[PDB]
Each structure stands twice: as structure tokens, then as C-alpha cells.
Amino acid sequence: XXXXXXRIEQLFPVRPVRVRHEDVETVKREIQEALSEKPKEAAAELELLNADHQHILRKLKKMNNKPERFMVFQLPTRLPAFRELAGKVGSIRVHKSGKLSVKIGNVVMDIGKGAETTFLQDVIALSIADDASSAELLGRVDGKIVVTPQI
Amino acid sequence: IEEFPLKISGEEESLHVFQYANRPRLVGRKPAEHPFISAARYKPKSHLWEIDIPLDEQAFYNKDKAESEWNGVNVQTLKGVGVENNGQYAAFVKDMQVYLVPIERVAQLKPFFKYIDDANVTRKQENRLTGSLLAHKVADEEANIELTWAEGTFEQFKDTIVKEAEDKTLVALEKQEDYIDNL
Amino acid sequence: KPIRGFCQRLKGKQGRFRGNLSGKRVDFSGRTVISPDPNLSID
Amino acid sequence: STQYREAPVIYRGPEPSHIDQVMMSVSDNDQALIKVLLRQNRRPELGDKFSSRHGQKGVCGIIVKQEDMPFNDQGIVPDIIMNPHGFPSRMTVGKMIELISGKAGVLNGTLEYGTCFGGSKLEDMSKILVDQGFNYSGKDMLYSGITGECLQAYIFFGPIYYQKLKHMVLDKMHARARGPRAVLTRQP
Amino acid sequence: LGVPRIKEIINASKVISTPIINAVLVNDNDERAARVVKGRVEKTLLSDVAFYVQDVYKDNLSFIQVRIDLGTIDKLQLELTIEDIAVAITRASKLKIQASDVNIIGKDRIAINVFPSENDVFYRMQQLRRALPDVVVKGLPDISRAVINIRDDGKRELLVEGYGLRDVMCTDGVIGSRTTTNHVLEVFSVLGIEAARYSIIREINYTMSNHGMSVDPRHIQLLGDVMT
Amino acid sequence: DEINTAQDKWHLLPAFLKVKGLVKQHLDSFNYFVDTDLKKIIKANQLILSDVDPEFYLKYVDIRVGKKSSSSTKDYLTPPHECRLRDMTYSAPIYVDIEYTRGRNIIMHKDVEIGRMPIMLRSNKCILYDADESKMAKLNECPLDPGGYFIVNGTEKVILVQEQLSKNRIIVEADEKKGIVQASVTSSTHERKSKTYVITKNGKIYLKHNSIAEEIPIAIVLKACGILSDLEIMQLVCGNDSSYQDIFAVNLEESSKLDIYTQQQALEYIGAKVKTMRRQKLTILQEGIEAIATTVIAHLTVEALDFREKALYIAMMTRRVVMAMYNPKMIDDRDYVGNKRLELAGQLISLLFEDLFKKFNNDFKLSIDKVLKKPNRAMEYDALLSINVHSNNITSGLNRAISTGNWSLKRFKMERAGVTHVLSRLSYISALGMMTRISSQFEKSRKVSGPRALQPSQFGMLCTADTPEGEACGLVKNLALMTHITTDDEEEPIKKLCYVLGVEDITLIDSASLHLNYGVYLNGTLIGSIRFPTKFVTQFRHLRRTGKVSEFISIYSNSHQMAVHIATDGGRICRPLIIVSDGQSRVKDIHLRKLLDGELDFDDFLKLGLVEYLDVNEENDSYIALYEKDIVPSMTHLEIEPFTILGAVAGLIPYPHHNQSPRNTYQCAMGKQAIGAIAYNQFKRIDTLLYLMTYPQQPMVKTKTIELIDYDKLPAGQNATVAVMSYSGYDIEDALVLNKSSIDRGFGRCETRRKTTTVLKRYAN
Amino acid sequence: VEIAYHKCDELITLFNKGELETQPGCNEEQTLEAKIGGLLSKVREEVGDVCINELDNWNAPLIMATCGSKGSTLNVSQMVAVVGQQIISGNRVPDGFQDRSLPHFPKNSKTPQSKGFVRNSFFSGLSPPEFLFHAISGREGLVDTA
Amino acid sequence: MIVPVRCFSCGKVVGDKWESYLNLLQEDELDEGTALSRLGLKRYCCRRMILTHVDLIEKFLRYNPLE
Amino acid sequence: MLSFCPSCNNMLLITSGDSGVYTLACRSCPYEFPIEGIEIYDRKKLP
Ligand SMILES: [Zn+2]
Ligand SMILES: [Zn+2]
């Protein structure tokens, strides 16, 4: 950030992340993923998107058998015609040069790293039934994936 | 050049995501501790998530003013609604496969000040109704649905997700040229 | 509010003073387009 | 509203008119409707207003006989004489280009174009003018109508589109000696 | 410098847009000759000379600190080190909230004590740390700015944009005898009715000579006379 | 001889005008009114009910103009020229079908008439629609008449295009001396129109509303709108910026300076000042009044327990005010053509008809009550007599409003005049330029020349020369030659498409990262953030070019304010431009060959994505080439024809680019007053005043516009042989020397025709 | 004009990539504006003087300017040589779009062509952007006379 | 409306040239310039009288009220 | 100060409680940061 204003780590007076206006942008590109540390506009966004492709693939090969992590996927609402929908819709097939792609059906679409959400995201399963009801918590979210149709 | 299959599952399953607008996603190089949760609440047909995470009276609690102003302030209350949003799915990897379960009514849990509401009510203690008027009238008329809590049970859900995704398989027959006009 | 009072007969550009008292329509006057005439005396 | 007070429609015009249409009809609400159209032919006079599509308006200041007008080698005389002092300050060069384009156009038999950011090119019009025997710049040598001598300057000479504006001095001339006065102020 | 200027003059508006005070000097130099007077006439300087304003808290004491820099005061040739800043702060702070005991801790750090139905101390501290930088420690509290100029020649004068003529005439390094504002109502209060009518005449002549209008000065003299 | 696309691309302009004429704003608006808005008004006021007799409902099932279902053919309309002669209104009946219940359990239809709708000339309902000059001759109509105006009481009335500020959009406007910054949105919903200010006072941001009694601290309002964390408020109105946080900390602290707050407490503070509601439903003066206080605070109707949309709207408005406070020049320019919307004759008449229909229905319900309020003999037979007699009020109101130009609308509660003007018949071009005229909004503070100034952003949208002299100068503006006024397109499928294209909804995101990525807007309303905004914009434009989204939907990305805006509302002025891709123009002269062959009309150039409409805001992102000979790879569009920046009237001037511009404006004034030919039926007309030239000549030097607008068919002037020389001394200061015997031979000859009308009226005795 | 266009463009390149010497009374934006305004005025003056000296004797506008009956050498130079610089509200034509005067110029452009300098004369005719800038200046004059 | 009898400027009779000019354009189609010169319209004022004339009488006669 | 509560992220304020202690005493929540021999300083650069 910048010249910030001065027992438990997580119980101290929480101050806003403050930066000057002179380079409020140069901070932004670094602290887009610095707030994560997860375990010309044409070429720039393309490079960003490819770097996000590599980050997504790293996350997935980091997801291979974890029981607590999650990753919310955003998908087009009116998907390719096959909710009453079940089974093997398609796949996340990784192309060459390190870029990803998704075939939700026969259609082909490209993937994205979504927006950063620097706050805790916990996924629960509400199960309300007449006998008894319970909030089956399952885990926390690690980031969002956006999948957008291409032409 | 490799493949990563996608499985869609949990049609009848109902899932929710919490967004704690109060706790950071990570405070160091590893994710922050999951806040301890106890005594949760919910409302059908009105979709009000209410969560009561107990605070720390050991330090930074200000017991005298806490108890003098508001009687029960042990538990920090988080209140939020769930918003319908299509195209939302939760995912994990089990056997080099990604399993998608649809989410319903994601919530942003803001801090709640129930004790301030009730302390102020005790301070003050001495027709179509359309639109959002009906919303809060419903909220303070048809309410009070308690809801038990159960954390840690993930394996039953995951093995249901895997079971419901190995039995069904179907082919896509609609052309991508018709798909672009179906958006 | 169109009601016309005595203070509105007096006040304004077309009221009483500025409309009739110093500045008014006159008799024995005329108006038309002007054209040049270099053979006229300047007076 | 037996006896009928007269309320005739009198023609009050400085100049006579002619009746060219009398339409008898009924309106939507059942009652007779009369319309009489009066036509008045107008001849241009001193003080009538003309304009040339370039904002150079001006009244007719004199009507001179044809023999007093300057003439070229073919006996063409101007219908209008536009004073040259209206150009240097108003800077309507499009009017000059229009004169040359229209002149080359009539000589060549073609209507020309003055389209914005385009139109007929000035050098092509000059080529037409020279090929027809005229000076490239549109300046013909003229003879004075009143003396007959060659004018010592070449005169920019050609067709220009002119509009007669609705403002005619016949509708503007007004003279009051004594007449109606206001009931309130007793003023004219 | 046209019809609006003449309109303002003839209306005799006590407040005008763009007043200028043409204060000639007694010395001909920039370094430490013109800039000294320019420092003598300026709008606000605490924000210019503080280089930060602090908000210090302790177990029981709340200190508003400001570590003034000598570099600004020496580059921009001003004449004030600590106590002038302190006294200016007192009146200003007393004007907004109050000023009981301002202290100096030395090393160019003037410290303001703030001490006492609740949170009044915090509210006063917040508004104080806001309103403290925008106080006048040097110069005149009416001058918009000051510019040192050249009249197409070699002598340097300052045309100031303020509303104080008595103060600029009384400031050292300025000839009070030869100091003329644009403001007729300021001339009248300070110099009198005859100098005011001189000002009316001169300003109308200036407005009519920059436009190339030719009006006989006797008309302007008659206008000034009828006004005064 | 082969087509040269660098010079044959101008043929897109005649192809455009062949299907979208100069009078198309009026015709399209009236067609849309009589084809959809009448149905919408009927559906809105579908049923009218009475307090007594619940066994009674009167339904409005279908509406039509000018045609019954008894005969396939349309009704006989009196021709418009017959209406002009007899001083009648050129109108068509307004037919509805009615479900009114009989006493003995009977349900039935009908086709009843509820008045007469004045018909715009050459609209869908006009008899002149699709006539081939033989029908025009038989009807005594000129084929070159523009249409687009009404005949009420024999008078030709045009409803002039009105220019207003964009509704439902935020305008930030700072100030000097006072030092306030004021952001205001005019929320013009269907039932209400209110203004929601966000002022600055004593360094603190406040909210000001007409309904609210007091200006409210902004943090109180942000808490009342579900944003109570008091940290995200800072993250919503400042983000990560040391300056903005410093500016807004005062309001953050003033939230507590009263007291610490919850949502319901802030709602109570809001509700304590909501003035009143004319003393009805008085049992709601509680915390339950805040709901309509907040759902009346803007045009965003919140109907649930979520305030994400409205809260973020208020936060963005506050952020705009804060950015203006920190950095002036970050305020909106009120005279920017992107901030202007043009309301049209169809929308005007729609509002007028809806109000007259509401008054009709109120009176009809009361008459029904009177008829059924008797103890005995209350037979239901012929409930429609009160409709046979009360139908004249619709006709009377429509006629009166069009005739006088006064529009007394009670629902929106404004009394505006000058809506309609008499169609000027001084010349053919006079009528044509009367159409395509635009009147600017009143209360502009006419003391200044801000709006009077010519804006660079009006290039190719409004004529650069056609502005009047006198008092009105820049207040009256004229449409440029090749323009289009967009129509309201539904924002719902477009928002869904945005979500499909990568916009995460505005409810899934956190405040901290809100100002980290571009936020996607929709008619000024934030609907989510976007990663890769430029890719999103590019995909949206591809969807528009391929015909998936409507072509009048504009997308543009703002870089200072990190935003991607999508506009779908009507009233935006736009013009077609040739799309330039990869440094090449997409027309490439094969399409020009097909266009000249007759197939491949202009709308095919849109259905193939060769041209697209750009409104003013999209041009903020484009890079347009004047000619194909100067296209660089950085460019996005190509001009179809650069002279289209002038309107119809300025298209009379030959070589206007060689003149000093005031002379071009003066000619725009003079051409409307030129005497010439009026119409092919100008001798069948009987008009109040008509100046006709005896021997009109077409100009020797015309322009493309002259033949586009058919001025060469009804010219106003003569080609005078002119000698430019000083002569006789009677030609000084603009005076002209006229040749006698040119005058004798008929040069400059003209006639005046004047009409006198009398009525042999009837009397009570 | 080419030796003057290059000067203005290199001033633009200085003000953008590096830093040009700010005037005592004018900051970076006002310094550049006043600098190239003076540049464009001087270049128009030079072209006008060349035009006036080259003009033939018995040139009618020159005669009318010499005797003083109508017009000025400025008008003659605008008709013949160059319509110099369109001054709106006392300075170069403003930004009608986002940091840019017209969409027909690159964004963030402060070149003379893009900001109201009319290289053409009324004889040679104005390109569409010069035509718009001139119409803005003339409309300002007309609204002023109203 | 109908073609003037005389050139406005010279006074030459051009009213007997309109039908023959129309015939020269329609039948045995020629250029407008050559058709004008074939009729003896040498002066450009006389050429203007025919070249720029708009024959509005033929349109006005479509609205004959005595059919 | 511009300090926010770790519990409800509301605005933190200093208070003079028993024995004059300058605690950062949050409202709307039972939060309190007692200052124990420490200095909390929020300064801003000035140009
Ligand atoms: Zn002739
Ligand atoms: Zn707190």
C-alpha cells in the first residue's frame, strides 16, 4: 500500500489499505493477486488471461484430492441443449501454449479466473425436512472461475 | 493437450455460499481460520441467513459497557439474504474430475446488531402492503424458524455427488450456430 | 396567477410608466424599408 | 342572434387583388364555411429583398434600364449587379466559385455540383471556360452601358442563384397621421 | 476588462471579481528583495510549512503535533520559525473551537494539547486535525495570491489579488505612497473621496483604452463627479 | 466502368434515405405509438371497477386505430387535403373491444369507438401511405410533401422534436465560489418523476430529495441501504485511495456523531422526515415508511430484502461527488450531446393519450356508479351509452393539445407549451426544415451561452449551420442529414447476455475489489464487474454486428471512471458508419456493386455487419476516418459521406466549405424565407398566406443534398446573370442593382395568395 | 507550416514523454497551450505577410484594404493563404469528447490540426474537422452578437 | 411553371425552344449542351433559361379541377 | 485515525473511561483496544 497510519494477529484495529493517487493504478495490478497468494490493452489482457489460465491449472492440479477446498464456477445460464440435467456435460480440456478451454457440450468456450473476493467464502448445504433440519457446512471457496462462450 | 472431465450433479440438492463481508479471505500466507459457528438460523420463503459467532471475552471485549448497554453480547450476529443467481456452481476435484453442484441464493453475511435493535426497542418501550413493505412485514410477522448446525459432514455429500455423476451420460446434439442465438 | 392588479398596471416594460409616460406611440410617423440614394444631399 | 345587421368582409389592401378561388363548404359541425383566396401578382421594386445562398442579402436599391447596364461582347447584360465590397469582409469565396461553376455549367450544358467538401473542381470549370472562349477566372471585359467604353477593370460576370425573400417593402410600408387610439391610454 | 468592469464600477460593488493591488517596492531584486515582501503578503502557510500534521495519542494524553520544516521557510524567504506559527494557531484554533495551552516541544514541533456527553474529545480531535493545516501563520488573511511582475521594463513590482490596501501600503518594502488597487470602494475607505473619484476616472479610462474606444476624458470626469 | 469505393461509398446515403427518410423520427414514433403504445395503455388500464356491485367488471381487451374487424378493409378516412379545405381534423376512430357483464350471466365482445385519433400524415394509418402520385393526384396531395405533421382544424401542426437531458442518469456538476458539488439523477419512471440530489455541504456529502424534508447524511443513507459495515462504505465510495478516503472520512465519522447505527435505526432516521402522503393509509407512519422512502429515492424499484442495487447506485453517485471534490474537471458537461435525449411525437402523444384515457375512465366509472345507484329498475341493458357520449373527450383533448401546443398532463404534473408549431409553408425547404427541427429544454438559464455553443460532439448528429438568428441561437437545432434516433430496447435480455459474457452479478462481489476491475453498467445502473473489459466490449460489439443484440444498443468503455456502459434507451441520436477492421474498410466495393445493382439495400449493410450505428458515447471510443485514403490500422470506423454533417436546409449552399460560417448560418435562415414553388398541389391549396414565384429555376450549381431532398423539383429562386462591380452608387451596403426589362420579362416575379375564412354560424334562437 | 507543425509536435512530445519548462505564470498544461498558441499565431502572421506582399496591384481585396473601404489584410490572408486558428472562449477548441476534440483524431491529441488550426484558406476549402471548428468559432461570434 | 417566352437578360425568344429541346433530348438523344447549341442558344443567359427551367406546369396539371 | 473495528468493521473511536485510559472503544459492538504504554499516531504528508 502506502504510508499507512499506525497478542492475537486477527484482532487488531483493522485499517483500510491506503495508497496515494499518483500511482493508484500501479498498486492495483500487483494487489489484484497479491491479496490472494493462493496455494496495448489487447496484448496486456491476453497475457493476463494466459497467466490466469496457468494459475487456474495450478489450482486444479492442487485440487486433485483435497476434501475441504472449493472453487465456484460461473457458467452460462442457458447452457447448450442436452434443470433435470445430469451426467457428463463436457470437460475442461487444456490446449497448447498453456491455455485452457471448456467444451460444455459440442460448443467450445474459454475459461477465466473471475473476480477476486478478499473475504471468507464458506459453502453450506441447507437440508430442511419435516423431521429435522440441519446446516451441513462443507468447506470454503478458493476463487471463482468464469466460463464465457466464444465465437 | 490433456483432458479434465466435467460432471454436473445434485439436481435435487440445494447448496448455499456464505460471503463474510467482515473476515478477510487470508491474513497470512495460508487461509485464515474458519470462524467458529454456533446457533444458526434461517427463514423459508424469506431466505434470511442468521449466524451467531461467539466473540472473545478473554481480551478486547469491554465487559462492563457490553453488559451495561446490551445484555447478551457474547455472540456476534451475521445477517444476510440469499440472492438467486443462475449459472453458479461449486466445484472440487476427486479423481482428476471436476464436479459441479448448483448453488442457490448466495449470501453476504454482514455484521448484525440484534442487541442494539432490542436495546433500542426497550428504550422506546416507555391495506394491500405491496412492494418491499410486504417484505419486512413478512420478516417481522412470519418468522422464527430455528435451524440446527452440523459441520464436518462432507464425505456423504461428496460420495453422493460422485454416485449421481457416474450413472447418467448424454450426448450434445444442438449445433454451436444455434447455440449463439440461444443465449 | 393571472389576476392583474394596480401594481401590475404600473410595473414593467409595458406597464404604466415605462410603457406610456416616457416613451409612447406617436401620431404622424411612418416606417418602411430603407434604400440608398447617392444623389440626395446628406441632410 | 329577422333583421340583419351588415358585417361585410371588406378588402383593405394598398394594392388591388384578384379573386381566384371561392370555396363554399360545411365544417364538421354542421354550418357553412366560406373561404375566398385573393391573389396579388407582385413586381420587384425598390426595397425588395434578394439573397444568393451565401448570406449576402440586400434590397433592390435601383432598377435601371437595360441600356444603362454594362454589356459584354455578345450583348449579355446582368440581371443583378452585386457590389464587390460585400465579398472582402464576409469572405464568401463559395459565391465566387459558384459563379464560375455555374458559368462553366451553362456553357457546357451541365448542372454543376457545389457539394460540401467536394463539388465541381475549380480548375475543370476553368478549363471549360477557356475552351468556350472565356477567361478562366470568370472575368469578362465589359463595355459601359452609359458611355460605351470598355471598363478599365475586368468584371466578374456569370450566373448566380438568387432567391426573392418573402420580405417585400409593399408589406412593410406604413404611415400613420391620426387613427385609432387605445381606449385606456388614448395613445395610437 | 470590459463592459462587466464598467458595470461593476458604476454599480459601486463592494465586492468585485479579480481585484488587483499594484504595490511597487523600494528595492530592485528578486533574491531576498521582492520575495521577502511577497512572503509578507500571502494567503495560508501552515499547510505550506508543516510537511505533516500528526494526531498523537498516549495512555492518557492526546497531542496534535506538527513538525515544521526550516527548508520551506528558508527557500521561500519567510520570516517565522516557531512562536509566530504558535500564536497564529492560537487565534485560528480559538476562532474555530478554542486554544487554551499550545506548547512547543522544540526541534520545530509545536504540540497542541486537547483535553475535555462522550466522544467529544474524539470529535474535537478529528475536526482539529482537519481544520489545523488551513490556518494563516504568515501574510495577510485577505490576499488570494501574490505575483511579482514586469511592466515591459526592468523594475519589478508585485500585483497582489487581495482585498486589503491599507495593509499592503503598511507592509515594509512597499511604497505606501504609490500603491493602487482596482477597487474604488477600497480606495474610498482608505484614501478618501477625491482619490476614489480619481480611481473611478482612471479605471473607466483603462477599460475604454484597452478596447480602442475613443471617449473624451471629460465625459469620464463628469461620471466620476456625479458618482462622488 | 468499375466501381471506385473511395467515391461510390456515398451511395449508402441515398440507399439509407430511401428507407429512412428525413421525416422518419415523426413517422416512426407515431407508428410505434399506434402499434404498441396504445396496446400498452389499454393493458395498463385494462379494467375499471366500482366500489359497489362486485358482480360487475368492465374490461379493455383490444384497441385499434382506424380499422374495425367487421370489414377486412380499413375505414374510410376523409383525405387530408379535404380536412385542410373544410377545417377539419384528419383523424381515425379509436376502436376497442369490451367485456362488460350482463345481469343474467352473459359475457360478450363488441367493437366500439371511443373517439378519434389525429393521424400523422404518411403514417401507417394515413391514406397517403403507399400512394404512387396517381393516388396522390386523385387525393389532391403533393408527392413531395414530407408528412410527419397533423391536420387539426385544417391547420398543419408539427410536434417538434424535443431535446431533454437523459432520464435515469447521474450528472455530476461542481461549482465555484459556493464550492458545492452536486450529483443529480432525474428518475422518470412511468408513474413518477423525481430528482435525487447528492449535495456537498460544509465538506460533507448529503442526500437531498423533494419528498424528504431534510438533507440526509450520506453514510446514514448507505446504512439504510443495507451497507452498514462502515468500512465497505469507505470501500464503496473511495476504494484504495488516500485522497478520497481522507475526503469521505468526515461523513464516515458524522454517521456516528449522531450515534452508532444499525440498518433499522438508519431506516427510522430516514422515515422520520418523509413528509406525508395526503393523509391516506395513515396507519403506516412507522419504520414501515422507510420502505417507500427508499423505493421512491430513485428509479430503481427494490421489492425485496436486498438493497444491493440501490446501495451501490448511491455509493457510485457518492464516489462521483468525491472524485469531483478531489479533482474538478471530473464533472459532466450538461451540453454534451451524449447527455441529451430526443423525445418524439409518438412518446408525446402516448403520454397525452394515457392521461386523457385515465380521465375518460374515471368519468366513465362515476357515470356507471350514477346509473347503478338506484334501488329498483337497475337493468344492465346498454351500459355503453355513457361511452357513446363520453367518447368525445378523448377526441377533444387530443385535438386541443395538438392545436394549441399546451399539454396539461396531471399525472406527471407539468404544464408545457410550444409542443406543436404551425407547419411553415414559406417554401418547400421551409416545411422540410421545420421537420427535423429540435427545440431545446427550457430553464437553461438563457443568460449564458453554454447551451447556445456549438458542440464538437454534435458532429454528424445535428446540422452545424442550421441554427436560427435572433434570440434562439443554439436553442433551436436541426437534425443532420444521415442520423437515427434510437428506440427503447428491453434491458432484461441484455443484462442476461452480460452475465453470460463474464459479468459476475453485483451481489457476488466484495467491496474491496469493486474498484479493482471495470464495472459494467446498464442504462447507468451497475450490474456487476468484468474481468477483461475490452474483451467484453469487443464480444458485445461482435454480437451487435452479427445481429444477436439490437443494433441501437451502444457499448462504450470509460477509462477515467473505470466502467463499461451499455445504453438501450430510446432518444439517443446515432448515425451509420462504415466499420473499419484490420486497417481495411468492410465495404470493399463488391457490396457497392450489389447496392447499385438494386439488391443489397442499406439494411443489408447492417445485416452483414458492414456498417453500424454509433451514438455519441460510442464515438468517444471509436477512431473514425474521414476518407478511405487516410485509414490507419488504429482506426475503427469510416465516414460514409462527410457532407452529411449538414442538415437538409444547409444542403442548399453550394461550396459551403469556402464560406465563412456565419454566412452559412444566414443562408440557413434565408432559404426558409425564399419564395418559390410550394407543392404540386399549391394551386389546389387555400392557405392563409402563400408566396409563389412565377418562373422558378433550379440552381445552376446544386449539391448532392439538393437532389436527395428533391429541392431541384420545387426550387425557390432564379439564376440571375450577375456582374460583381460597383455601379451607380445605389449598391452600397448590400443594396442590389436590378435590371429593368429583366423584371419586365418576368425575373423575380411572384404572387401572394391570401385566404379569408368566414363561418355562417348558427344561433340559439 | 511544416516547420511550425514539427515544432508544435516536438513540444507535444516533450510535454508528454519528458517535461517541458513550465512558464512562471503557467503550469504544464497552460505553458504548452500558450506556447503553441503563440507559435500558431506567428505562423499565420508569416503566411499572411507572404500573401500580402505577393499580391498583385489592382488586386481588389488589397485595394479595398489599402483605401479602407472594406475588409482587412487579415481577411485577405484568410481568403488566400490560411484561416489560422479557431479561438473558442479565448483559447483553442475544447474537448468535446473524452480528452479529445473529435473522434476523427487520436485520443489525447494536442496537435494544431486536432485543436482548431485551419491549415486551409477559404479559397482552398475546409476539411470536415476544420469546417466544424470554424463553425464553432463563428457560432460563438453569432451568439455573442445576439 | 411554363417556360419563359424571353431570356431574362438578352430578351431573346426562348419560349419556342422548350418543346424542340425536349424532343432533341428524348428523340435522337443528344447532350444538353449540343441540344442547346443546335437551337441557337449561344449566349449563356439564353442557355440558362432552358437548362435550368423546371416544368412545374405539367405537375400542376395533374390536379386538374375540371376533369 | 481512520480505524475500524475487528468485530463489525464499524468506525473506531477513542474514549476516556475509568482512570482516564484512552482506549479505542468501538461502538455497536463489545470491542475495546486498550492503549498500554503505546503510541498511536496517524499523520498525513503535506505539500
Ligand atoms: Zn440570353
Ligand atoms: Zn465494531
UniProtKB/Swiss-Prot annotation, chain A:
Identify residues that carry Phosphoserine.
S36
Kindly list the places in or outside the cell where this protein is found, as annotated in its UniProt entry.
Answer: Nucleus
Where is composition skewed (Basic and acidic residues) in this entry? Answer: 31-39
Function (record text): DNA-dependent RNA polymerase catalyzes the transcription of DNA into RNA using the four ribonucleoside triphosphates as substrates. Specific peripheric component of RNA polymerase III which synthesizes small RNAs, such as 5S rRNA and tRNAs. Essential for tRNA synthesis. The RPC53/RPC4-RPC37/RPC5 subcomplex is required for terminator recognition and reinitiation.
Q: Which family does it belong to?
A: Belongs to the eukaryotic RPC4/POLR3D RNA polymerase subunit family.
Share any extra remarks.
Present with 998 molecules/cell in log phase SD medium.
Q: How does it assemble?
A: Component of the RNA polymerase III (Pol III) complex consisting of 17 subunits. Interacts with RPC37/RPC5. RPC53/RPC4, RPC37/RPC5 and RPC11/RPC10 probably form a Pol III subcomplex.
Q: What is this protein called?
A: DNA-directed RNA polymerase III subunit RPC4
Organism, scientific name: Saccharomyces cerevisiae (strain ATCC 204508 / S288c) (Baker's yeast)
Supply the source organism's classification: Eukaryota, Fungi, Dikarya, Ascomycota, Saccharomycotina
Curated annotation (Swiss-Prot), chain B:
Keyword Phosphoprotein assigned = yes
- Tagged with keyword Hydrolase: no
A cellular component term, taken from the record's GO annotations: RNA polymerase III complex
Its BP terms in the Gene Ontology are:
termination of RNA polymerase III transcription; transcription by RNA polymerase III; transcription initiation at RNA polymerase III promoter; tRNA transcription by RNA polymerase III
Q: Which UniProt keywords apply?
A: DNA-directed RNA polymerase, Nucleus, Phosphoprotein, Transcription
Chief location bin: nucleus
> Which locations, inside or outside the cell, does it occupy?
Nucleus
Q: What else is known?
A: Present with 1590 molecules/cell in log phase SD medium.
- Purpose of the protein: DNA-dependent RNA polymerase catalyzes the transcription of DNA into RNA using the four ribonucleoside triphosphates as substrates. Specific peripheric component of RNA polymerase III which synthesizes small RNAs, such as 5S rRNA and tRNAs. The RPC53/RPC4-RPC37/RPC5 subcomplex is required for terminator recognition and reinitiation.
Q: How does it assemble?
A: Component of the RNA polymerase III (Pol III) complex consisting of 17 subunits. Interacts with RPC53/RPC4. RPC53/RPC4, RPC37/RPC5 and RPC11/RPC10 probably form a Pol III subcomplex.
Q: What is this protein called?
A: DNA-directed RNA polymerase III subunit RPC5
Organism field: Saccharomyces cerevisiae (strain ATCC 204508 / S288c) (Baker's yeast)
The beginning of the lineage is:
Eukaryota, Fungi, Dikarya, Ascomycota, Saccharomycotina
Swiss-Prot record, chain F:
Gene Ontology biological process terms from the UniProt entry: termination of RNA polymerase III transcription; transcription by RNA polymerase III; transcription initiation at RNA polymerase III promoter; tRNA transcription by RNA polymerase III
Subcellular localization, as worded in the UniProt entry: Nucleus
According to the UniProt entry, what is the EC number of this protein?
2.7.7.6
Record field: catalytic activity:
RNA(n) + a ribonucleoside 5'-triphosphate = RNA(n+1) + diphosphate
Could you give a GO molecular-function term held by this entry? Answer: DNA binding
Q: Which UniProt keywords apply?
A: DNA-directed RNA polymerase, Metal-binding, Nucleotidyltransferase, Nucleus, Transcription, Transferase, Zinc, Zinc-finger
Q: Which domain of life is it from?
A: Eukaryota
One GO cellular component term, please give it: nucleoplasm
Into which family does the record put it?
Answer: Belongs to the RNA polymerase beta chain family.
User: What does this gene product do?
Assistant: DNA-dependent RNA polymerase catalyzes the transcription of DNA into RNA using the four ribonucleoside triphosphates as substrates. Second largest core component of RNA polymerase III which synthesizes small RNAs, such as 5S rRNA and tRNAs. Proposed to contribute to the polymerase catalytic activity and forms the polymerase active center together with the largest subunit. Pol III is composed of mobile elements and RPC2 is part of the core element with the central large cleft and probably a clamp element that moves to open and close the cleft.
Give the free-text miscellaneous remark of the entry.
Present with 1950 molecules/cell in log phase SD medium.
Assembly notes: Component of the RNA polymerase III (Pol III) complex consisting of 17 subunits.
Q: What is this protein called?
A: DNA-directed RNA polymerase III subunit RPC2
The encoding gene is RET1
Region of the whole protein represented: 36 to 800 of 1149
Swiss-Prot record, chain H:
Query: What is said about its interaction partners and assembly?
Result: Component of the RNA polymerase I (Pol I), RNA polymerase II (Pol II) and RNA polymerase III (Pol III) complexes. Component of the RNA polymerase I (Pol I) complex consisting of 14 subunits: RPA135, RPA190, RPC40, RPA14, RPB5, RPO26, RPA43, RPB8, RPA12, RPB10, RPC19, RPC10, RPA49 and RPA34. The complex is composed of a horseshoe-shaped core containing ten subunits (RPA135, RPA190, RPB5, RPO26, RPB8, RPB10, RPC10, RPA12, RPC19 and RPC40) where RPA135 and RPA190 form the DNA-binding cleft.
Mind naming one GO cellular-component term on file for this protein?
RNA polymerase III complex
InterPro entries, alphabetized: RNA_pol_su_RPB10, RNA_pol_suN_Zn-BS, RPABC5/Rpb10
**A biological process from GO:** transcription initiation at RNA polymerase III promoter
Residues bound to Zn(2+) are C7, C10, C45, C46
Source organism per UniProt: Saccharomyces cerevisiae (strain ATCC 204508 / S288c)
Name of protein: DNA-directed RNA polymerases I, II, and III subunit RPABC5
Record's keyword terms, sorted: DNA-directed RNA polymerase, Isopeptide bond, Metal-binding, Nucleus, Ribosome biogenesis, Transcription, Ubl conjugation, Zinc
Further remark: Present with 5300 molecules/cell in log phase SD medium.
User: What family is this protein classified in?
Assistant: Belongs to the archaeal Rpo10/eukaryotic RPB10 RNA polymerase subunit family.
User: HAMAP family per the record?
Assistant: RNApol_arch_Rpo10
Compartment(s): Nucleus, Nucleolus
